[PDB]
Amino acid sequence: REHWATRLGLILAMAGNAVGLGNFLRFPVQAAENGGGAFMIPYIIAFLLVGIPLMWIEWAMGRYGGAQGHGTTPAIFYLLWRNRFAKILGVFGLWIPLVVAIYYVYIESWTLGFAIKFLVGLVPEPPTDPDSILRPFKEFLYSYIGVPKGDEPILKPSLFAYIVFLITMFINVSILIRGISKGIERFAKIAMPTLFILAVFLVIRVFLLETPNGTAADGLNFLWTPDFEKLKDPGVWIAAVGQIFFTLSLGFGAIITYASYVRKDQDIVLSGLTAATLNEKAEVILGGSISIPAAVAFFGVANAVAIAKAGAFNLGFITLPAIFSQTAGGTFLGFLWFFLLFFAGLTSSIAIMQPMIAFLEDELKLSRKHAVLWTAAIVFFSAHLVMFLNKSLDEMDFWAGTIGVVFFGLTELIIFFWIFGADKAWEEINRGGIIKVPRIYYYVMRYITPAFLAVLLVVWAREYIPKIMEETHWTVWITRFYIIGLFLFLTFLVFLAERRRN
Numbered sequence: 001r002e003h004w005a006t007r008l009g010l011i012l013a014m015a016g017n018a019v020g021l022g023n024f025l026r027f028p029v030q031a032a033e034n035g036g037g038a039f040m041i042p043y044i045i046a047f048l049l050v051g052i053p054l055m056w057i058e059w060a061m062g063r064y065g066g067a068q069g070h071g072t073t074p075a076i077f078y079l080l081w082r083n084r085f086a087k088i089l090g091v092f093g094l095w096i097p098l099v100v101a102i103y104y105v106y107i108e109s110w111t112l113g114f115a116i117k118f119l120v121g122l123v124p125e126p127p128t129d130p131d132s133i134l135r136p137f138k139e140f141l142y143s144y145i146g147v148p149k150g151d152e153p154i155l156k157p158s159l160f161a162y163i164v165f166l167i168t169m170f171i172n173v174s175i176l177i178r179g180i181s182k183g184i185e186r187f188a189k190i191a192m193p194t195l196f197i198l199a200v201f202l203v204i205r206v207f208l209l210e211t212p213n214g215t216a217a218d219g220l221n222f223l224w225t226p227d228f229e230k231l232k233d234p235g236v237w238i239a240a241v242g243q244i245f246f247t248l249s250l251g252f253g254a255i256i257t258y259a260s261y262v263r264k265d266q267d268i269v270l271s272g273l274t275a276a277t278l279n280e281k282a283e284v285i286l287g288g289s290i291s292i293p294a295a296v297a298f299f300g301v302a303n304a305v306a307i308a309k310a311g312a313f314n315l316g317f318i319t320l321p322a323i324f325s326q327t328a329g330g331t332f333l334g335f336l337w338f339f340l341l342f343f344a345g346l347t348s349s350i351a352i353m354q355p356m357i358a359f360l361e362d363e364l365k366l367s368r369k370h371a372v373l374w375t376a377a378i379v380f381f382s383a384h385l386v387m388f389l390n391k392s393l394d395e396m397d398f399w400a401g402t403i404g405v406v407f408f409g410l411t412e413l414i415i416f417f418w419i420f421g422a423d424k425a426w427e428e429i430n431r432g433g434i435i436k437v438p439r440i441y442y443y444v445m446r447y448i449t450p451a452f453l454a455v456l457l458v459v460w461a462r463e464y465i466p467k468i469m470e471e472t473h474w475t476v477w478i479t480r481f482y483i484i485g486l487f488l489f490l491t492f493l494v495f496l497a498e499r500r501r502n
């Protein structure tokens with residue numbers, strides 16, 4: 001095989017893959033925790049030396065594998081490098097997107113549930129004291145996802161949240177089951193424009209927010225005012241790189257799978273650059289101009305930063321709607337906010353489930369319908385772990401969405417640009433390109449990028465190896481045990497797929 005119908009649809013599909021919850025939730029938090037402008041320099045650099053090259057690399061690998069009827073890494077890694085271990089490493093191209101999808105889709109169902117409740121107007125009703133304004137919404141969120149009073153391991157999701165999660169899964173399925181061109185592409189051409197429009201509107205509305213405590217203006221200033229005292233802080237660089245990986249959907253095997261449906265002769269250079277650029281625009285210009293400026297507007301910079309450090313969902317699901325509730329038509333404004341998050345998340349969720357679907361179709365020769373339904377079944381079932389187990393979400397997001405993507409990014413780059421050959425890879429990347437990659441990026445891909453990632457991983461491992469063993473909560477061990485099981489499961493499927501070939 002299936003292919004993208006038009007170039008536009010391809011672009012919007014890829015853009016739909018990248019632009020998501022990571023733009024309007026993760027980014028604002030990351031940028032706020034790291035000192036605003038101080039975070040932007042490493043962010044941009046990371047975008048130039050990591051995001052772009054890896055994006056092109058994944059597009060290339062994707063199309064390359066797609067030409068031979070393989071959209072997933074287990075097979076592609078083998079095409080690029082002949083080895084059993086290459087397939088084993090390729091398993092991550094399925095494990096990562098699957099694990100991430102498990103909790104990602106659940107968070108997506110959250111945005112949907114909130115969108116509905118805010119649309120219908122069922123929300124907490126605040127009365128000049130910040131806590132008296134935020135508390136109702138904190139209780140609102142906690143009641144929705146069933147957060148425990150103290151630090152208790154069990155979550156008690158409301159019936160509504162559960163039902164909404166089912167609906168979300170259904171929507172994802174209804175889109176995925178129609179295929180690449182008919183299902184994903186069609187929806188992209190609608191969801192994306194809608195997304196951009198809503199984002200712009202929100203940006204403007206938020207912009208107009210001004211109080212005795214501050215202005216959205218001050219927030220934007222805080223975000224775009226350079227600070228170089230933080231450039232000696234490794235944590236900032238690590239956070240920047242992590243954000244780049246997450247937002248561009250790098251290391252998730254999603255880009256590759258999407259790229260495998262691009263015709264062998266079609267350009268991946270300009271298309272890839274456009275998709276990445278669109279994402280960054282949606283991230284720094286749109287995402288960073290909504291939450292932070294609003295928080296700063298009402299509570300000021302210091303408090304806004306504190307709120308950001310408080311949590312990832314605290315700014316998006318609590319603070320912002322609480323701020324909106326204090327303005328005329330603030331309930332409807334909250335709805336637009338959660339409808340935006342839902343479309344952004346939906347366009348991404350379908351992208352991280354596709355790798356699994358593509359593997360079942362290509363390697364196990366399953367029909368699209370069956371592949372989708374089973375993928376949905378697996379995700380839905382596994383989701384109960386994230387739904388009822390506290391801290392499970394964070395564990396999955398860490399192992400898969402943080403460490404895994406970087407490790408996998410390094411792995412894929414090493415396999416493609418080193419083992420498979422640098423020149424053959426470069427030639428494969430530039431082939432059919434409407435425009436050609438700057439020569440300098442050849443030396444960036446072959447030397448700079450892998451070294452940077454390697455160093456990053458080394459640093460990470462050092463701090464984490466001791467902490468892992470000494471962790472008190474059982475919920476995390478359960479999660480670890482289960483996801484390890486998923487890995488074995490996928491490895492087994494790859495084994496079967498391998499045997500069927502012979």
Ligand SMILES: CC(C)C[C@H](N)C(=O)O
Pocket residue numbers: 017018019020021022023100246247248249252254348349351352
């Ligand atoms: C896992 C990825 C599909 C996440 C997506 N790139 C986002 O920014 O939300």
Ligand code: NA
Pocket residue numbers: 015016017018019020021343344345346347348349
């Ligand atoms: Na998206």
Ligand code: NA
Pocket residue numbers: 017018019020022023246247248249279283
């Ligand atoms: Na993104």
